[PDB]
Enzyme design. Structure first.
Site, PDB file in Angstrom:
ATOM      1  N   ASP A 254      15.369   8.859   0.960  1.00 19.82           N
ATOM      2  CA  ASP A 254      14.543   8.474   1.654  1.00 19.82           C
ATOM      3  C   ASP A 254      14.900   6.604   1.845  1.00 19.82           C
ATOM      4  O   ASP A 254      14.015   5.816   1.673  1.00 19.82           O
ATOM      5  CB  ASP A 254      13.280   8.398   0.986  1.00 19.82           C
ATOM      6  CG  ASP A 254      12.002   8.273   2.006  1.00 19.82           C
ATOM      7  OD1 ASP A 254      12.093   8.569   3.148  1.00 19.82           O
ATOM      8  OD2 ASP A 254      11.168   7.719   1.584  1.00 19.82           O
TER       9      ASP A 254
ATOM     10  N   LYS B  11       2.532  -0.379  -9.404  1.00 24.25           N
ATOM     11  CA  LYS B  11       2.220   0.495  -8.211  1.00 24.25           C
ATOM     12  C   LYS B  11       1.546   1.361  -9.041  1.00 24.25           C
ATOM     13  O   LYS B  11       1.972   2.194  -9.831  1.00 24.25           O
ATOM     14  CB  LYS B  11       3.716   1.024  -7.854  1.00 24.25           C
ATOM     15  CG  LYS B  11       3.729   2.252  -7.041  1.00 24.25           C
ATOM     16  CD  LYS B  11       5.394   2.558  -6.560  1.00 24.25           C
ATOM     17  CE  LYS B  11       5.152   3.789  -5.908  1.00 24.25           C
ATOM     18  NZ  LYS B  11       6.368   4.243  -5.318  1.00 24.25           N
TER      19      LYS B  11
ATOM     20  N   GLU C  90       0.726  -1.135   0.046  1.00 20.88           N
ATOM     21  CA  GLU C  90      -0.052  -0.132   0.073  1.00 20.88           C
ATOM     22  C   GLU C  90       0.865   1.356   0.030  1.00 20.88           C
ATOM     23  O   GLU C  90       2.140   1.093   0.257  1.00 20.88           O
ATOM     24  CB  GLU C  90      -0.810  -0.100   1.505  1.00 20.88           C
ATOM     25  CG  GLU C  90      -2.298   0.642   0.908  1.00 20.88           C
ATOM     26  CD  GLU C  90      -3.010   1.460   2.156  1.00 20.88           C
ATOM     27  OE1 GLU C  90      -3.351   2.501   1.567  1.00 20.88           O
ATOM     28  OE2 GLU C  90      -2.800   1.113   3.064  1.00 20.88           O
ATOM     29  N   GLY C  91       0.335   2.448  -0.460  1.00 18.15           N
ATOM     30  CA  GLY C  91       1.049   3.602  -0.385  1.00 18.15           C
ATOM     31  C   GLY C  91       0.339   4.917  -0.364  1.00 18.15           C
ATOM     32  O   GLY C  91      -0.996   4.974  -0.412  1.00 18.15           O
ATOM     33  N   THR C  92       0.829   6.070  -0.263  1.00 12.48           N
ATOM     34  CA  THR C  92       0.238   7.371   0.014  1.00 12.48           C
ATOM     35  C   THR C  92      -0.657   7.727  -1.118  1.00 12.48           C
ATOM     36  O   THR C  92      -1.749   8.358  -1.118  1.00 12.48           O
ATOM     37  CB  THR C  92       1.308   8.402   0.131  1.00 12.48           C
ATOM     38  OG1 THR C  92       2.253   8.026   1.236  1.00 12.48           O
ATOM     39  CG2 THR C  92       0.836   9.701   0.589  1.00 12.48           C
ATOM     40  N   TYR C  93      -0.338   7.292  -2.436  1.00 10.55           N
ATOM     41  CA  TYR C  93      -0.980   7.730  -3.658  1.00 10.55           C
ATOM     42  C   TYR C  93      -1.709   6.444  -4.497  1.00 10.55           C
ATOM     43  O   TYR C  93      -2.472   6.790  -5.224  1.00 10.55           O
ATOM     44  CB  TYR C  93      -0.203   8.629  -4.350  1.00 10.55           C
ATOM     45  CG  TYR C  93       0.255   9.902  -3.873  1.00 10.55           C
ATOM     46  CD1 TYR C  93      -0.421  10.795  -3.738  1.00 10.55           C
ATOM     47  CD2 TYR C  93       1.656   9.891  -3.257  1.00 10.55           C
ATOM     48  CE1 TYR C  93       0.055  12.203  -2.976  1.00 10.55           C
ATOM     49  CE2 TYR C  93       1.722  10.958  -2.625  1.00 10.55           C
ATOM     50  CZ  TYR C  93       1.364  12.234  -2.639  1.00 10.55           C
ATOM     51  OH  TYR C  93       1.787  13.047  -1.820  1.00 10.55           O
ATOM     52  N   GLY C  94      -1.365   5.448  -3.749  1.00  8.16           N
ATOM     53  CA  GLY C  94      -2.236   4.144  -4.459  1.00  8.16           C
ATOM     54  C   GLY C  94      -1.838   2.812  -3.957  1.00  8.16           C
ATOM     55  O   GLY C  94      -0.951   2.903  -2.866  1.00  8.16           O
ATOM     56  N   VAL C  95      -2.216   1.686  -4.432  1.00  6.06           N
ATOM     57  CA  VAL C  95      -1.808   0.264  -3.975  1.00  6.06           C
ATOM     58  C   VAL C  95      -1.184  -0.425  -4.991  1.00  6.06           C
ATOM     59  O   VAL C  95      -1.030  -0.308  -6.111  1.00  6.06           O
ATOM     60  CB  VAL C  95      -3.101  -0.160  -3.673  1.00  6.06           C
ATOM     61  CG1 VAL C  95      -3.123  -1.848  -3.395  1.00  6.06           C
ATOM     62  CG2 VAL C  95      -4.211   0.401  -2.750  1.00  6.06           C
ATOM     63  N   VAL C  96      -0.129  -1.263  -4.148  1.00  3.94           N
ATOM     64  CA  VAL C  96       0.899  -2.155  -5.061  1.00  3.94           C
ATOM     65  C   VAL C  96       0.215  -3.382  -5.129  1.00  3.94           C
ATOM     66  O   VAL C  96      -0.523  -4.065  -3.891  1.00  3.94           O
ATOM     67  CB  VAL C  96       2.222  -2.141  -4.418  1.00  3.94           C
ATOM     68  CG1 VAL C  96       3.208  -2.993  -5.368  1.00  3.94           C
ATOM     69  CG2 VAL C  96       2.956  -0.550  -4.336  1.00  3.94           C
TER      70      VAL C  96
END
Ligand code: ADP
Ligand code: MG
Ligand code: MG
Length: 288
Positions: free
Chosen positions: A124, A37, A17-23
């Site tokens: 990062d 992604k 999962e992520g800030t702008y979408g799902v993996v």
């Protein structure tokens, strides 16, 4: 189903999962497994990420194989990786096996050395952005904050636990040193299983670093005083905690290497390449 420039991809299970979408896990028409992604001002960040990934072709850097463009979302197509280092640390709350710390650190250094040689800084590096496949290969991922040399920097709330003290003090200059600090934090985390500098707030970050490695001394590192936050802030003066208390019982050559990664002065900090040549790696096959 999603159509790229290279192939057609069948969406399988959500593997991240992520800030702008799902993996998601996905399959090729020919059967080859991949990662998708999905990305929802935000399109500029994804474009930067793709352009940097296309310059970085290395076994220790996640391979970008295709891009799917949709009016709705930008989909990045990567080689599949079973896990990440955060997931590995979650199964080993008291650290990793010494041979594994050595393997993972060497690969982390090699991927970063490739970056640095190609004039790109990751910026990062943290266990969740370090992907590990079904064969134990460590690869760098998430080039969302990466900085190419000569290209100006262009905001999401992220952890400052792996950020270099001079950057936290307002330094904005391009330095390969910023990544080596993060590597040091990761190296120490793989030894204990716990984050080295887990400050309670963004404000606690520098006092937390200083509480462990000591408050920097302007006579040792004169350039601290030149930094913006050092001028507008007063820090509690601390003495360095012995390495014997930070990482109890770890090998002497590993302590020496870690100490060269965690020094305050960016000009004194070891480079990724010199760290690969450090006595700590003497026994390790460089051809892994
Ligand atoms: N190539 C990949 N193979 C499998 N899972 C992946 C892959 N890339 C990312 N993931 C998973 O999903 C998360 C992806 O987030 P990431 O790439 O770091 O983007 P972001 O944090 O910007 O939203 C990872 O931390 C990991 O859990
Ligand atoms: Mg990430
Ligand atoms: Mg991102």
């Amino acid at each position: 189903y999603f159509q790229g420039l290279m192939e057609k991809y069948q969406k399988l299970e959500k593997v991240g999962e992520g800030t702008y979408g799902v993996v998601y896990k996905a399959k090729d028409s020919q059967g080859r497994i991949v990662a998708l992604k999905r990305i929802r001002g935000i399109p500029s960040t994804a474009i930067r990420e793709i352009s940097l990934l296309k310059e970085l072709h290395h076994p220790n850097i996640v391979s970008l194989i295709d891009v799917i463009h949709s009016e709705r979302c930008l989909t990045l197509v990567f080689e599949f990786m079973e896990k990440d280092l955060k997931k590995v640390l979650d199964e080993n709350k008291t650290g990793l096996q010494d041979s594994q710390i050595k393997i993972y650190l060497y690969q982390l250094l090699r991927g970063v050395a490739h970056c640095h040689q190609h004039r790109i800084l990751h910026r990062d590096l943290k266990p969740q952005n370090l992907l590990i496949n079904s064969d134990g290969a460590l690869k760098l991922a998430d080039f969302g904050l990466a900085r190419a040399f000569g290209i100006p920097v262009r905001h999401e709330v992220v952890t400052l636990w792996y950020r270099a003290p001079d950057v936290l003090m307002g330094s904005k200059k391009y330095s390969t040193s910023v990544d080596i600090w993060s590597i040091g934090c990761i190296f120490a985390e793989m030894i204990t299983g716990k984050p080295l500098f887990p400050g309670v707030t963004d404000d606690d970050q520098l006092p937390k670093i200083f509480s462990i490695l000591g408050t920097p001394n302007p006579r040792e590192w004169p350039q601290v005083q030149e930094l913006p936050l050092w001028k507008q802030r007063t820090f509690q003066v601390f003495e360095k905690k012995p390495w014997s208390s930070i990482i109890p019982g770890f090998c002497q050559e590993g302590i020496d290497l870690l100490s060269n990664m965690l020094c305050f002065d960016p000009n004194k900090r070891i480079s990724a390449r010199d760290a690969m040549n450090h006595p700590y790696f003497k026994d390790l096959d460089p051809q892994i």
